[PDB]
Symmetry: D2
Subunit: 259 residues, 4 copies
């Protein structure tokens, strides 16, 4: 009877997940966090589920955690949404964080690297959207954000297959966001670059290297790395019901780099 909306956030033990969960809880949502199990020492885990759950529960959110599902597959994504609906009976918002980073010269790319970028950058999008949309269509309302990459808006040398498949994800999102708009469902993509979190600081090798860090920031028009507080704010605005008038769109979030 409380009629609390439910937001799914994937890869939620890092990147935008933790800050987005906090603000979605502040906005009255119950939460489903997909991510990697383990404590803060686990690789890729920036904020563990145990730490997040305690804070999110303090905010009044009910939280379901989902770990060790392979979201590059139909099975993983279908299982995830079945568990969402079992717990909460509804899905109002979904933040699908996708991707697998591969960089290098185009002619150096192997079949394995090609397979991996397709699995991360496209299969996660295809199967994720096939899983989250049915309950949204059934309800006549929903909001989805797919995280792709700012490289999808300008695929450049050394990120040919990563950036190119990100552009494909953006295109799928355009079609899908337009196709389900008549059912009250928004699907948009956000693509970031130059964000201050471990994943970026490693791919750019700015980690523990102030001189590298500074050269990287100088590549950004706004001369800084973006923060997860800023990104969670924009992302929540596309998932909290406050804006029901954009769909099928791609939003660059990279300090002007993808303008």
């Amino acid at each position: 009877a409380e009629n609390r909306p439910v937001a799914l956030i994937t890869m939620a033990t890092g990147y935008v997940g933790p800050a987005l969960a906090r603000t979605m809880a502040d906005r009255g949502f119950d939460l489903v966090l997909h991510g990697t199990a383990g404590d803060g020492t686990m690789v890729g885990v920036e904020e563990s589920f145990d730490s997040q759950i305690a804070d999110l529960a303090k905010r009044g959110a009910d939280v379901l955690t989902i770990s060790d599902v392979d979201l590059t597959t139909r099975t993983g994504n279908q299982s995830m949404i079945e568990r969402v609906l079992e717990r909460f009976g509804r899905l109002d918002s979904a933040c699908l964080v996708t991707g697998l980073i591969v960089t290098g010269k185009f002619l150096d790319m192997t079949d394995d690297q090609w397979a991996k970028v397709k699995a991360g950058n496209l299969d996660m999008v295809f199967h994720g959207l096939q899983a989250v949309l049915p309950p949204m269509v059934a309800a006549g309302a929903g909001q989805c954000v797919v995280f792709t990459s700012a490289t999808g808006g300008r695929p450049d040398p050394m990120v040919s297959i990563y950036g190119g498949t990100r552009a494909g994800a953006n295109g799928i999102v355009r079609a899908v966001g337009l196709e389900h708009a008549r059912h009250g469902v928004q699907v948009n993509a956000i693509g970031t670059n130059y964000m201050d979190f471990p994943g970026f600081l490693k791919a750019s090798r700015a980690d523990g290297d102030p001189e590298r860090r500074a050269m990287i920031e100088a590549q950004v028009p706004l001369r800084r790395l973006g923060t997860m507080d800023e990104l969670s704010s924009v992302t929540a605005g596309l998932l909290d019901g406050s804006n029901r008038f954009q769909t099928g769109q791609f939003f660059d979030f990279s300090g002007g780099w993808g303008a």
Copy 2:
């Protein structure tokens, strides 16, 4: 002290709702717009009606109503009055444009002059006036309202949509050019918005059948509300997001996707 937001054409369109939420977010306000009560032609919410409410929200308000924003003089004078009153300018929402439609080969020199003045001169002179105090302060946020037509200039909208695309291009360059000074400049272009101006021009006002026909042109099958638009606009003007600049955002229910 409280940061200061300038909003133009603020007696209609997004202005009133944006003023309300910016006041909620802790800003003082400078409202440029049209003098008079709600019975005047352009006035959707009078200055008089807004001042009472915005003061209750904690905002000091300065109104400016006698300036032509197609010229250097009008915009320079507006910003001079902002700084005289509050000593700062943190955010600016510049609403621009003059609508002309019709066959390209029917457009007169006067129609061409007018769309350039509304769609381009207001942007050029507006940004030249608001940016200097922001650059001097090392921080600022600007949203220029152009049009969703700028993202897809179409038949029967050639000179309007085309000059809107030009305004978006100016915003791209200017937003990238002043990024190193901590200043953001972005553009928003709408269509199919639920406000009296569009309702009356489309004949959806008071006409449910016509409104349904108009909504059917929109992927999301509705008209956007000013509360929604003001939320998105304020998110680019309230300090919460300092990581987008030089960008154009379509806000038309998917119509410009």
Copy 3:
């Protein structure tokens, strides 16, 4: 000796292939035609190799045909280019026709449909470019056109996974064209729609139906279907050495539909 340049054209028994081969021969090229074996009464064969070879040889062009090789894989594309180089010792231009059409509601798409579109719209591009570029890089000059689809410039409802993956192919071409510009190797994409050839008439269901065809033509700003003579002229202009100053670009060729 004669220093005749060599152009590869794939899927050349239909679509733009036959007209492009004629005009490239006229412009002084030797030709490698990949395609489907069989006479004109074969499915998908608009002009058989036998009929094309007679005419192309009359124009002075040497022709190598490459039949029944699968271009969705590394092995097929690598074998194709090995045979090009064994026969002619060079590859100056390549027209890579790619794709596999699937349409329908996004939520009706099966894993098999998804695999199929990825293989046609992305794997053919990845493996095709990995095969054709090395000899062009070695020579310090080359020109490539990848045929994707006008839907890649505007992925729409009912065309989500096809148009979206086409957008990804366009993005790969952008990055690859920019990345090999230092080697003098242009890589551009052309995306068509509403072309007067069987493949479109079937997907649109306008064949033998003047009313449906008239409805389809009315969706085109220029109010007609495009011809292979027009398309081959534009394509040859990106492959004949006359224009070496565009790369990484996508060109819509759909009567204004993708403008």
Copy 4:
């Protein structure tokens, strides 16, 4: 009877090479340009230097000078002279623009007026003049030269690049709007072309060192040639391709990709 192609600014830029290949392709020619010999400012191939070669290729040639193509009067006069001479206008190559660069906040009202006249008025009035005879005939092909900067309006090029984006938008709408009449209108935008206007704007003229620095900005690492550009341009004007309209083509060595 030969079809007729109008080419403006034809004493420099793409004009001379385009005239040569359009003559080869069977066209008679109207060449608008600057009167005088090659020592005149901007004259790369004088009218006098071109005429013998063009006649040998089979073309009748009318030359036109001293019309202000930023105005309705000049463009209307030009097309009237085309029709009086040849009775038809099949193809038009409208070269437009006036380069201004510098910091946005340094731009004067005079600089703003000049870029609007060059980058927008030339397009508006040029298209209003060439299209009526093409629509009446049920066929025509037009290329408007804007700038590659219109695809990516950048710092230091704000009002030039921005208004070029507007010209591209006008061309999109107009190309779509007259497609039902069998008329194509497309834009080509160049940068990094090997001709005096670009060399001077980039300050690389007559200076191998600075030219190398400029070429380093281009993915294909050189300046484009007029033979290449005229090939692409003629392909949109020679009747061979009647299936693109309302489009913008970057021609800048990948710089605008």
